[PDB]
Symmetry: D2
Subunit: 495 residues, 4 copies
């Protein structure tokens, strides 16, 4: 009979569960959104209990939807929004605070303190990361320093830290497995990517007790079975979502690159077994560990990509569904002079301005909602443009193509705009959910669903190519006004 691989993809915006077959084809998908909590502008939080309820309910749903039961599932693969920090009671499994999301800006001033104290080069060398509110360590420190009774419980060994993967695996195993993988660990700013170990010097700097940390495991390995209560399904793959997308795009050789258009926008290049330090404001990170071999990546991180479309839908309410942004944008011929820097949670690479905020500029009396949707799409593509120009310099290579994926990559208009900005081709494959696909791959190799990586190479199938159709001079004048708008967005928040 038929066997399937289950990928759980716990995203910033929704949790997904997808069933793949041996051909890498999606057979069934369930998806469920969960609340984006903003206690004050600049802060972003998730209910850790709704992360779990949304993720496990769509897991039950997709199996049921498939007409099958857990008996037909070969293995579970876990991938997740990265950096986001959960802290719970080791004995009751209750979160002691909400999850603080990677987008949250509240630790910006402390990160600036750490820069002024001289820690930038030490942090970069050990972790590949920059001193930004983006990563987990300062969020963990915030919870231990601010939640009533948290510091004393952590020093007694009664607390657990996790990125979302660890939280989900904890809940899936009734607390019997407290683990993370190297790729998720590398995003915490507590994990030395050169020694591939939690860094006691960094733990000392952040005043974090080592006992609160999970065990770091490789990205593809039978770690154990589920036991929420219950069905015994092997959990065999873990990876941060953007690394899993890289794995899902077959970018397993040095120099291969993809960009994901999801809640944010993330460009990752595989750098083999060498940690490459950026000269152009990008991150050094761990790609995965498989068969005992570590692979590294360079990364450009854009905080708000598709989330700017979600803002048009839920905040501004000028569209009813995400898919209408392209239709609305096409009611106008161009951006009409409007530029939208979507720094709704600050600016990531290459700017790293924790204090920039969302900025729409150039509005006149004839500006319409169509111009706003079109400038939203351009602002997404402008941000990816900037991290690609950073990565090309780090690589000292001019690109001729770019593989793309993620939910916002479904917009043909967005991909054409992006192609036009780049002056080279955009390549969109048949399966846009490469994040979940990569996790399925990682788990499937570990249990033997697939015999080797060569077996799954022929599954990467191009669906549509976009080629540039615009004058390089006019593109450079749009780019010029984009960079001018970005500066207008910066150094806005003072507190």
């Amino acid at each position: 009979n038929e066997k399937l691989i289950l990928a759980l993809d716990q995203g910033t915006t929704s949790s997904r569960a997808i069933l793949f077959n041996k051909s890498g084809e999606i057979k069934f998908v369930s998806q469920k959104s969960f609340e984006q909590i903003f206690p004050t502008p600049g802060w972003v939080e998730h209910d850790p209990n709704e992360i779990w309820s949304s993720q496990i309910s769509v897991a039950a749903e997709v199996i049921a939807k498939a007409g099958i039961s857990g008996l037909e599932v070969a293995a579970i693969g876990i991938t997740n929004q990265r950096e986001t920090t959960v802290v719970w009671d080791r004995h009751t499994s209750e979160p002691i605070y909400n999850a603080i999301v990677w987008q949250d800006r509240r630790t910006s001033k402390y990160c600036d303190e750490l820069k002024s104290q001289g820690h930038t080069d030490e942090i970069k060398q050990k972790t590949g990361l920059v001193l930004d509110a983006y990563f987990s360590a300062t969020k963990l420190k915030w919870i231990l320093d601010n939640v009533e009774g948290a510091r004393e419980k952590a020093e007694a060994g009664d607390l657990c830290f996790g990125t979302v993967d660890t939280w989900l695996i904890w809940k899936l195993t009734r607390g019997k497995m407290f683990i993370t993988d190297v790729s998720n660990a590398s995003r915490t700013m507590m994990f030395n990517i050169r020694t591939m170990d939690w860094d006691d010097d960094l733990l000392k700097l952040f005043n974090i007790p080592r006992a609160i940390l999970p065990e770091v495991k490789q990205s593809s390995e039978v770690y154990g079975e589920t036991s929420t209560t219950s069905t015994k399904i092997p959990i065999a793959g873990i990876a941060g979502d953007q690394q899993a997308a890289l794995f899902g795009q077959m970018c397993t050789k040095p120099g291969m690159v993809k960009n994901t258009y999801g809640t944010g926008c993330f460009l990752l290049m595989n750098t083999g077994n060498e940690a490459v330090y950026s000269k152009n404001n990008l991150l050094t990170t761990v790609a995965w560990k498989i068969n005992g071999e570590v692979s590294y990546a360079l990364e450009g991180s854009v905080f708000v990509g598709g989330a700017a479309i979600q803002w048009l839908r839920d905040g501004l309410k000028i569209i009813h569904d995400s898919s209408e942004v392209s239709t609305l944008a096409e009611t106008v011929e161009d951006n009409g002079g409007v530029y939208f820097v979507p720094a709704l949670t600050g600016l990531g690479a290459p700017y790293w301005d924790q204090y920039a905020r969302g900025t729409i500029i150039g509005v006149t009396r004839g500006t319409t909602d169509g111009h706003i949707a079109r400038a939203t799409l351009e602002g997404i593509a402008f941000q990816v443009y900037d991290i690609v120009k950073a990565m090309e310099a780090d690589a000292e290579t001019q690109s001729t193509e770019l593989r793309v994926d993620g939910g916002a990559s479904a917009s043909n208009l967005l991909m054409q705009i992006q192609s036009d900005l780049f002056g080279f081709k955009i390549i969109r494959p048949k399966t846009l959910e490469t994040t979940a696909l990569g996790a399925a791959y990682l788990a499937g190799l570990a249990v033997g669903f697939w015999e080797s990586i060569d077996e799954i190479q022929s599954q990467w199938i191009i669906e549509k190519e976009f080629t540039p159709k615009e004058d390089k001079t006019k593109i450079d004048n749009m780019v010029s006004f984009w960079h001018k708008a970005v500066k207008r967005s910066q150094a806005w928040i003072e507190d």
Copy 2:
């Protein structure tokens, strides 16, 4: 704190509710699923989406609460018919919903051949497309190979309770309760067993039918899932019978009306099956501690679903709750009547060919009047089955207990009270369908020690008393009945 899980698989959404021992709702999850209309008059559900929607809200509500579930009670949209391969659990056709009208002409054939009274005497039911038997026969007649498979015992028939329990136990339990079984038109409510005369009439092989059980007893436990532990399954009842039990209507003469997808008025008649003389149904309420209780029922096909049509179809409201605000933009119905026969007419009309009819429209008619007429149309339909039941019982009621999602509309309840000429009692918990399933399961595992323990949990939240002149009410009822006749005998095929 131990809890009891109620699964309420409705016509338009699946729910999972956790109750504590005080009868309070502690956690609730709900998820809609697709209403499939292959041609006007047909109504289908995907059985795998009935299942996926029901199991995902069960997983979600358990997860929300953070092993501590004492038992599960199962309750469901009745009559809706599911047929599946016994070895694969693959449905061989969509579920054919109770509202579906495709078997109307075959029912009329059986009427003309003289099977109407035999069916009434055996099953308590009116020969109508409403019930399961003709839907199962359609599937066996029209699905390639299904007939030979059913004859060999390789297929299963179930109402939705049976389908849910099949999937919950990975095909280890193939059961229904007496209340659901009584809605199939294959179950004799006097012998309390499947009827061989009716099975031969509809050409249904007995091998395809589940075992009929009590409404409250530990049947077994759920099969191993990802989201929970093995949980006892300990209650089953058709949703409207569960609502009657949830309303504490355990004594002869007690009545409730549910305002849900449709509208359903049931009176408990004790150990006595009471045959209607006024176009109502005689049905099984439940079986508990070995004792069978019966009911008289008035069945309205489209009640809250007409509000859903204003939202999804006409799109003059964005959410169900907005129907009352919109109706309150006008002072009265403006001359407009809406017979919501969107799936034909149920009791007391039993017109399979009636269709939705809006009449009396003028140039000043607004969307406010349409909303008002929608609510009045729900209330007028309930009016007609109450008058029928008052005739059967030879009583003039002085009050009526109500529940259900659409009973949240204070305006709809005021309209209803004005039409009735007596009081309407709305309790604190409107989800009496799920509550009743919880009660049946909880009594069975001892979560509650006796029905005397749960009495105190019925709490009155608001009473509505009539306001309008009787002669004005009489005029409106007269035009309503005039509109009903304009709706009738519309479809010919």
Copy 3:
């Protein structure tokens, strides 16, 4: 450039259109006014807002044209028919709202007159049927129900008028109190055989003769405007549907047009002969020009484009009238839904004063798309029934139909109509043939144009719709339409 000014006082909006010598619309202004419903079934207009809306669009279109009133060669007047205005001869103040042709309040009295044997009499004298549609019972209602009206009327202190007469009264500050033969024929007080007010009918409705305007030809220089002001010659008057017949060049016996406006109105030119209908149509006066009277056969549908305005204003499922076509195209067919738009009862061939708007066939899958599509079909089905009645009367099978009016702009409605008939629909370049015809009447009177022959070449086909064959579907739709119509009938009782 010399221009001709047409004033088209419609049921829904007042319009002013300036035409050149080529018959081309050069400028147009339009303004809606309030539709007043004191109780369901009643329909009233504020006569002062008819005036203020009409005089303000006249001013606006002249200013819009970069010209002044001096450049205007003449004014032609056309109007919603039957609608009844009564005002004080001395103060020009109306004594009551205008009672609109759609109004049903006089239905029971019409039935009274029927049961007293007056049906054959009314038809012989006027060509009309006993129905709340026509002016006489509305005027009688006002004299009988307005405090002091009956005394003022017998004293000669009141004026009656259809809307042409009201506008001309205001335009001349009471110096001209006139109507034309076509408007007059709609009052049920004007004998179309003698071509004069009928004293027997006046006795029956208890209407004093002194309250009636003088009936004039449809094309002749009556006098000048004089609101205070500038003298422009008023030189043409016609009821709007007869103006549309004249605007469609339907000046020879047997020529036909249907207008898709607030209602739907099918008129055939019958020349010098008043043909009496055997299929529930009206016999009416088309016009009188150069001393020559032309008659027509008419089929009258009360609610056509008004059903679209009801989707916009009442149901609010469209924002603009033109969106009805787009919404209707979101579905492939009516989905089983039928909409009998009897919002003001049923006109020809049913003449049911008590029928009311009816939507039937709704199921759980029915959408606003189907409602839009059923609305367009209901317009087309009602035109289908009067065309079939006119073919029987004429003993002729049509092979084409010239169409016009605001709702004829809908390509989907015209295709549906062509599909139902199985023959082509011809839409001309100017949809405002009501206004065009009124302009023709005034232009011929002042010599702006020399003759009918001269204007013939101005009628230019914009688009032809040819029928798409779907015989089984169409027969089934028409059958359920007739079934639906019966479900709408005999609804109101009081």
Copy 4:
């Protein structure tokens, strides 16, 4: 009873209002007309639609009234119309006051040292706001225009002159002192067209109208189909008309109008006062042979930003919904909206600033956007009041307000909170039209004195401030931060 007809030709719509002797509105009609944007930054009106919309509303109110003792004319200022003298056909669209196309040429004149001369002669600053560069653009860019202008075959007019031209079928070619002062071709010290400025802008004197008093029987309208000949007896630029309508006829008296833009005017008596804080010196009116002057702060986009929410962004469907939508949130949520949709007027005078929304986060709603629009209106008025207080060396304790957008109670409370003093809103918000009526009525003796009409000014509501001055100072600080982020945006 006789009535006065005020014709208020606004930037957004044309209105006609009939007032009785008590100053109450007896009839009012309003009709919008098209805002044409050939390219972002440009703003044009169809002069034929200005005319038709104004006639339509006039004919409608005259129809309802049916006794018009006189007509007062008031209008959007600066907006420039050029037409053929013999055919009355305009040779180009009207170039509206908001239009920015002449910005680079104004900067060219600044570089060539003409700022002080322009300010001393006209009270104005070199900005695309004013008529002169718009007239020059039309004469330069429309084929054959310059030949016709030198031969005296063309007419120039602000909107008052265009309306009177059409109302009299070309028999009267006039403007008043207040409208003329806004052209940058009229010397407000000599009170006459300035030959030196005309030479500078290459404008022939033969295309200008005759400048008249603001209250005087100039003549009568021509006979129309809808009315007899009516005396035309008052003309003033709309914002000066509002100053008159607010009874601000004594030195030091101030009002602010919240209309399409926002305009703060103080009467300075018979003395032209030159600003030291980026305001304009302008002619208030001339009545009974006496010229009155004013200081003015000009905000280009006030209520027009609400119209942009309605027509552009479409998050409201009627202008009045802005307050309700803004009340769905408790504060601006960190969002600031600089409504520089046509550049920035006083005190910034940045022709190249454009509309800027800043501070957006993921939880920002359309509610916050509505609230930031109202605050942005109030912030701009805050800035011109602060500049005016510096010129006048006086701390205000109150401010009289009027205009279509002042009907928003929320907007007025925000403004009061920011100011820290009270806002006085009178019963009739149409003080522009009221002032036109007053000017016309005085001229024909409908009212026999200024003192007679004084009692017609009735306070309808007073708003008192209710917020902490430091929390306001921080909002104001961020507002000023946002303004700078909007500036020097356009390069061409």
